[PDB]
Design a protein around this ligand. Structure first.
Ligand SMILES: Nc1nc2c(c(=O)[nH]1)N[C@H]1C(S)=C(S)[C@@H](COP(=O)(O)OP(=O)(O)OC[C@H]3O[C@@H](n4cnc5c(=O)[nH]c(N)nc54)[C@H](O)[C@@H]3O)O[C@H]1N2
Ligand SMILES: Nc1nc2c(c(=O)[nH]1)N[C@H]1C(S)=C(S)[C@@H](COP(=O)(O)OP(=O)(O)OC[C@H]3O[C@@H](n4cnc5c(=O)[nH]c(N)nc54)[C@H](O)[C@@H]3O)O[C@H]1N2
Ligand code: SF4
Ligand code: SF4
Ligand code: SF4
Ligand code: SF4
Ligand SMILES: [Cl-]
Ligand SMILES: [Cl-]
Ligand SMILES: [Cl-]
Ligand SMILES: [Cl-]
Ligand SMILES: [Cl-]
Ligand SMILES: [S]
Ligand SMILES: [W+6]
Lengths: 955, 214
């Protein structure tokens, strides 16, 4: 029979229909698009369109496999044995490594001897449960995908608007009058997005692609502007100057809804590429030097006439005056002609009745000033009145299907679910933890994070419902206050692993043997583990690192457990897409062979650990024994429905809150009704409202829209988005102080007959009574962003090291708050990127013959100019080499790549796909991460995979 | 009967269509290698009824004209393939009068496959070296009879692929041509009066493929 699902690949979130033999009990026989889904309307890219081949695949794992120390083979074992043995490894390693107090005598209750990677590929209920299992075990080294592509940039949106998320959503692109795609190859990497992009074009939108390469995206845009690697901030700074010089900013929006009018204190300055407060010894700023001038109430002073010399807007004008078209054209390599054309077309959206949107994904924002790149986009959007509006926004495109959700559920070392921070060792009590929230004295500033105590208490009640929150607070592990936060993150986990500091690793739904930069180093590091648990669909380069190229299994002592999980269409649960749409999906076919859903694997593993503790005792058993997993279980299995209900939350006593009376056991209708006093639980405050007494709102397949909703495609009854179904964030900025839309033809909200109609208003209150950015301490869209480590305004610092010696904007060449060799044997700028047909490391898509058929081998894209230099012809076999490794690829010689002129010298770019690996297929090639450095970023602690030095030579 | 209108001015070369054809028919994958192109399979074959052809054309200044051609049987109104097969065996090639589909049956194994391929002005038919059966795009004739879009049409995210009754599709082709011709002055329709798969090309069709038009 017929069931609905949601694609397991990218964060567009396309709907599927799955047909299963034997009335829904047997194998899948067909998987195609859901014609009723509002995002894809039945369309699928080749990845979604081949899900049938992913699931009904005789190369999938069938049962658990064990690799003994020094063995060259797998042994098939039972689940009961594999999970008992893993439980025993976990308990031994935890018992041996558990630290109640750190060296300073502070309570930390952690194990630093186990790390976990993964995963954005798991369901939201699975991600939430997984984090809680790992933290109940005392883990702090908990990371996944989001660190690599999203963490380097999301603080830019939090600084600018108050939240880290994509501001609008996919369907909303169709309302744009100008779409700037920059640091994104959306036609290949978010393909169904082009349904809505091309619909904007149909209605007269200009489509602009700013990219070092001409791609399948570029082919369908009106304007293609080449940019040299790392020259984004110059490009965007020039657009800011253009907007200010030509008076194209939306005055009333800027005056009312941005911090343009705020007065910056006298200690702020910038000279010679350095802001005030620079500590040259420790290479950091004293950001207190960037404070606003506060009034007698502690509130920033304001000059709504925008005349005071220290008004944010006047400081901004002065800052960006250097970014003239000649200097910007010279560093970007974009002709002055093309820059003007792009600036004119984009800046035209400053009109109230026009909207422009910016789409970026990963691009090259990995480096130390990627945050400032995105800051610049946020600032351009605030100057043009494009934040909060239909067809506007900063559309930060999420990568994996559920990376939004995996981040939401705290699978990163610095956060619990719902972006509550992991406590540090000096947060000795729950009261100390809660002491840390900044307050506003501005009656118009909502400053919503003041509610955090309710969310932390309700989280502790979800995990430990029979314990008082202050007591349960002592069950969860803490990081050291004294340590750099990046010490707990992705890159340093690999570094620690290579120094032998981990006994165990969970590679849960990731393939770090191909996905991590400098694969040679990481593959050898994995041999320093005592034990590795890999949970995945297929045997892979990680599960089997011990028989990889140049490895001798007889010399590697690591025990490996491979646990085969089931594909998306074989399980139930939710995934949160890029627009925060939390979409429910159903089981079609039964799990293949003896594969299991992640939730079943982790819950059974944890229950066996709990049994071992009950039988034997061990280190600090309370967090393990008292964890509430009974709320997670139905039919002796993991229950997506029950976990989703707990993540929403329910009342643990009769409660009066928000002027309403609730009964013990009722679902919490929204996070507005959470309490700090133990009356409520909620696994994730962002989920409070997703699963109410009305039922599972994530499972709504209702295209009901009012005329106002339909005109812009909000689809408010199709699934549910956080927060509380606000489809367009910051939507109070889309109206004037009387609540009338700037653009009535594309209204997001409007005040009619005493209520907001359209979207759910982002912040309750009558028109003109509240600042539109309710998550900001001060309530404004931040043009000046004094929380950023590199400064309150973006400034060009060269992210390239090897080909640049001079910065034309200042005497500071590189980021002043951030050891590339630049060996002249590797003269070309290597870069890695995706194609439409493959997924991530290709672990999944290299198993799908139809995708291999289209893109069977690693290739190397080069210009005719580089081919000429090296004697390469199209289709030649080439060796691509770096200081870290070497691989062979097929040459693709194409005019889609052109040389950069950098300081009077042609510098060539070499393009590689990172989708290949030694396991499969035959003659596919190995990972481009053999080539990439692991050196990592001082600021972001984020790897370099978009510009790294290589050679390419004919074989 | 029915017609496809294929607006190549909207194609992102996602190859959803190429994959969706194989998923729906459960066709085998070919052994392929990269020989200096994204294009693969390089050609139609007995097991590949659609492939996306990729052509780069130089343009002065930044970027190229990147031409994408998702090739399939044109379902000719008076099909030459059928004229040739019928000489050997009626029933090898038949016309479905409901949809306009030109359909190859198992009896193609008993006709001169080489001659049938040569008769096709679009060089579409392909022979199985083992069974000698001919294959090509069947218009997803069985989905269409059952009120569904062809697999490659439903999957297309861009509006490139369109399908419907011939009157509706010719009206859309005429209207869309006028609109696209604004941006692409060399835009034309492929043999719109002879075939049921009507391509809008953005320039000389023969730049997309040597057999793009008759
Ligand atoms: N088909 C497919 N889709 C995917 C994935 C996949 O593997 N395959 N992965 C998913 C994931 S996890 C993620 S995070 C996203 C990432 O999605 P994208 O960020 O779109 O991915 P890339 O293709 O790596 O890079 C985008 C573009 O950045 C350009 N670029 C490189 N350097 C610069 C620079 O200095 N400036 C500018 N402006 N552009 C630059 C590259 O030329 C490339 O075209 O994609 C997701 N979608
Ligand atoms: N050089 C270079 N390196 C890169 C990148 C780049 O652009 N260049 N991109 C980076 C980025 S943005 C990312 S996000 C990472 C991705 O790195 P990884 O996440 O390690 O990559 P994959 O493992 O290929 O990602 C898909 C995984 O999800 C698994 N999977 C799918 N469904 C399930 C399920 O239900 N459960 C479980 N347990 N597993 C499941 C698949 O089997 C597969 O292992 O790579 C990073 N690495
Ligand atoms: S990979 Fe992304 S665009 Fe393609 S079908 Fe899946 S969700 Fe849709
Ligand atoms: S395109 Fe060729 S194979 Fe198809 S109907 Fe016409 S003559 Fe026959
Ligand atoms: S109409 Fe059907 S058979 Fe023909 S190319 Fe499309 S999917 Fe394949
Ligand atoms: S699915 Fe549509 S956009 Fe994608 S290659 Fe086929 S015709 Fe072009
Ligand atoms: Cl079956
Ligand atoms: Cl054993
Ligand atoms: Cl329990
Ligand atoms: Cl409906
Ligand atoms: Cl390195
Ligand atoms: S991701
Ligand atoms: W990613």
């Amino acid at each position: 029979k017929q069931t609905t699902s949601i694609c397991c690949y990218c964060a567009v979130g396309c709907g599927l229909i799955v047909h299963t033999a034997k009335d829904g009990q047997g194998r899948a026989v067909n998987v195609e698009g859901d014609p009723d889904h509002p995002i894809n309307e039945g369309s699928l890219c080749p990845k979604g369109a081949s899900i049938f081949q992913l699931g009904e695949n005789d190369q999938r794992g069938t049962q658990p496999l064990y690799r003994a120390p020094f063995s060259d083979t797998w042994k098939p074992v039972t689940w009961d044995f594999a999970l008992t043995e893993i439980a025993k490894r976990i308990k031994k390693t935890r018992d041996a490594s558990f630290t109640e107090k750190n060296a300073a005598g502070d309570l930390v209750n952690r194990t630093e001897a186990i790390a976990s990677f993964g995963s954005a590929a798991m369901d939201n209920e699975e991600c939430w449960a997984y984090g809680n299992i790992l933290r109940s075990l005392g883990l702090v080294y908990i990371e996944h995908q989001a660190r690599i592509x999203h963490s380097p940039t999301v603080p830019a949106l939090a600084e600018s608007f108050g939240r880290g998320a994509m501001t609008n959503h996919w369907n909303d692109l169709a309302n744009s009058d100008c779409i700037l795609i920059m640091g994104s190859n959306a036609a290949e990497n978010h393909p169904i997005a082009f349904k809505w992009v091309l619909r904007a074009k149909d209605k007269g939108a200009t489509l602009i692609h700013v990219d070092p390469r001409f791609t399948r995206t570029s082919a369908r845009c009106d304007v293609y502007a080449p940019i040299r690697s790392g020259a984004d901030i110059p490009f965007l700074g020039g657009l800011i100057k253009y907007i200010l010089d030509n008076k194209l900013y939306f005055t009333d929006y800027v005056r009312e809804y941005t911090n343009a009018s705020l007065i910056v204190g006298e200690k702020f300055s910038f000279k010679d590429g350095l802001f005030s407060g620079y500590d040259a010894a420790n290479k950091k700023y004293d950001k207190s030097m960037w404070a606003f001038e506060l009034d007698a109430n502690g509130v920033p002073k304001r000059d709504p006439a925008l005349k005071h010399p220290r008004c944010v807007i006047n400081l901004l004008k002065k800052h960006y005056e250097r970014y003239n078209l000649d200097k910007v054209a010279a560093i970007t390599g974009t002709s002055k002609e093309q820059l003007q054309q792009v600036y004119k077309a984009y800046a035209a959206t400053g009109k109230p009745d026009k909207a422009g949107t910016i789409m970026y994904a990963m691009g090259w924002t990995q480096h130390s000033v990627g945050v400032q790149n995105i800051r610049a986009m946020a600032m351009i959007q605030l100057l043009l009145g494009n934040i909060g509006v239909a067809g506007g926004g900063v559309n930060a495109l999420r990568g994996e299907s559920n990376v939004q959700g995996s981040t939401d559920q705290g699978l990163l070392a610095h956060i619990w679910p719902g972006y509550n921070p992991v406590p540090n060792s000096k947060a000795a009590t729950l009261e100390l933890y809660n002491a840390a929230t900044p307050q506003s004295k501005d009656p118009m500033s909502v400053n919503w994070w003041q509610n955090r105590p309710k969310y932390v208490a309700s989280y502790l009640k979800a995990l430990y419902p029979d314990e008082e929150p202050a007591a349960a607070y002592d069950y969860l592990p803490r990081i050291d206050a004294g340590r750099k936060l990046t010490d707990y993150f992705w890159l340093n986990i690999f570094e620690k692993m290579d120094k032998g500091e981990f006994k165990g690793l969970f590679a849960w739904g990731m393939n770090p043997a191909c996905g991590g930069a400098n694969a040679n180093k990481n593959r050898k590091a994995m041999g320093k583990l005592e034990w590795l648990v890999n949970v995945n669909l297929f045997e892979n380069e990680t599960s089997s690192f011990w028989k990889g190229p140049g490895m001798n299994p007889a010399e590697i002592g690591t025990e490996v457990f491979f646990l085969p999980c089931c594909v998306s269409i074989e399980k139930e649960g939710s995934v949160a897409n890029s627009g925060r749409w939390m979409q429910w999906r159903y089981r079609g076919p039964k799990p293949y062979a003896e594969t299991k859903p992640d939730g079943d694997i982790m819950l059974d593993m944890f229950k066996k650990v709990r049994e071992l503790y009950a039988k034997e005792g061990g280190a600090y058993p309370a967090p393990i024994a008292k964890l509430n997993i009974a709320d997670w279980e139905e039919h002796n299995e993991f229950s997506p429905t029950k976990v989703a209900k707990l993540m929403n939350g329910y009342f643990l006593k009769d409660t009066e809150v928000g002027g309403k009376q609730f009964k013990k056991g009722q679902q919490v209708p929204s996070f507005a009704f959470l309490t700090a006093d133990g009356s409520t639980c909620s696994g994730n405050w962002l989920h409070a409202g997703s699963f109410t007494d009305a039922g599972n709102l994530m499972a709504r397949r209702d295209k009901t829209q009012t005329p106002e909703q339909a005109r812009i495609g909000l689809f408010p009854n199709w699934s549910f988005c956080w927060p509380v179904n606000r489809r367009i964030l910051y939507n109070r900025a889309s109206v004037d102080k009387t609540g009338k839309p700037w653009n009535p033809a594309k209204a997001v909200i409007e005040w009619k007959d005493g209520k907001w109609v359209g979207d759910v208003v982002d912040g309750g209150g009558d028109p003109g009574t509240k600042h539109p950015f309710i998550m900001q301490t001060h309530g404004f869209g931040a043009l000046y962003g004094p929380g950023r480590e590199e400064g309150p305004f973006p400034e060009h610092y060269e992210p390239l090291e090897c080909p640049v010696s001079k910065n034309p904007f200042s005497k500071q060449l590189h980021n002043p708050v951030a050891k590339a060799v630049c060996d002249p044997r590797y003269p070309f700028i290597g870069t890695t990127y995706r194609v439409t047909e493959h997924w991530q490391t290709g672990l999944m898509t290299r198993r799908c013959a139809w995708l291999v058929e289209a893109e069977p081998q690693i290739f190397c894209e080069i210009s005719k100019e580089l081919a000429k230099l090296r004697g390469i012809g199209n289709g030649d076999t080439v060796k691509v080499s770096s200081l870290r490794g070497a691989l062979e690829a097929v040459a693709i010689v194409t005019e889609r790549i052109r040389p950069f002129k950098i300081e009077g010298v042609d510098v060539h770019m070499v393009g590689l796909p990172w989708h290949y690996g030694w396991m499969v297929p035959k003659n596919g090639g190995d990972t481009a991460n053999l080539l990439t450095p692991s050196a990592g970023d001082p600021n972001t602690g984020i790897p370099e995979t978009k510009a790294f030095m290589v050679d390419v030579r004919k074989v | 009967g029915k017609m496809f209108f294929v607006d190549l001015s909207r194609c992102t070369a996602c190859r959803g269509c190429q994959i969706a054809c194989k998923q729906w028919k459960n066709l085998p994958a070919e052994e392929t290698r990269n020989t200096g192109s994204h294009q693969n399979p390089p050609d139609l074959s007995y097991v590949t009824l659609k492939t996306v052809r990729f052509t780069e054309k130089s343009r002065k200044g930044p970027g190229i004209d990147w031409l994408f051609f998702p090739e399939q049987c044109r379902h000719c109104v008076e099909p030459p393939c059928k004229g040739q097969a019928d000489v050997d065996l009626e029933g090898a090639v038949v016309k479905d009068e409901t949809t306009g589909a030109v359909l190859f049956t198992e009896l193609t194994a008993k006709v001169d496959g080489e001659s049938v391929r040569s008769a096709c002005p679009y060089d579409i038919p392909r022979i199985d070296p083992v069974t000698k059966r001919l294959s090509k795009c069947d218009m997803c004739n069985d989905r269409v009879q059952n009120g569904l879009l062809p697999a490659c049409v439903k999957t297309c995210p861009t509006g490139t692929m369109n399908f419907g009754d011939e009157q509706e599709m010719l009206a859309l082709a005429e209207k869309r041509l006028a609109e696209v011709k604004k941006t692409y002055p060399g835009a034309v329709l492929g043999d719109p009066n002879d075939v049921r798969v009507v391509y809008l090309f953005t320039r000389d069709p023969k730049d997309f493929y040597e057999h793009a038009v008759a």
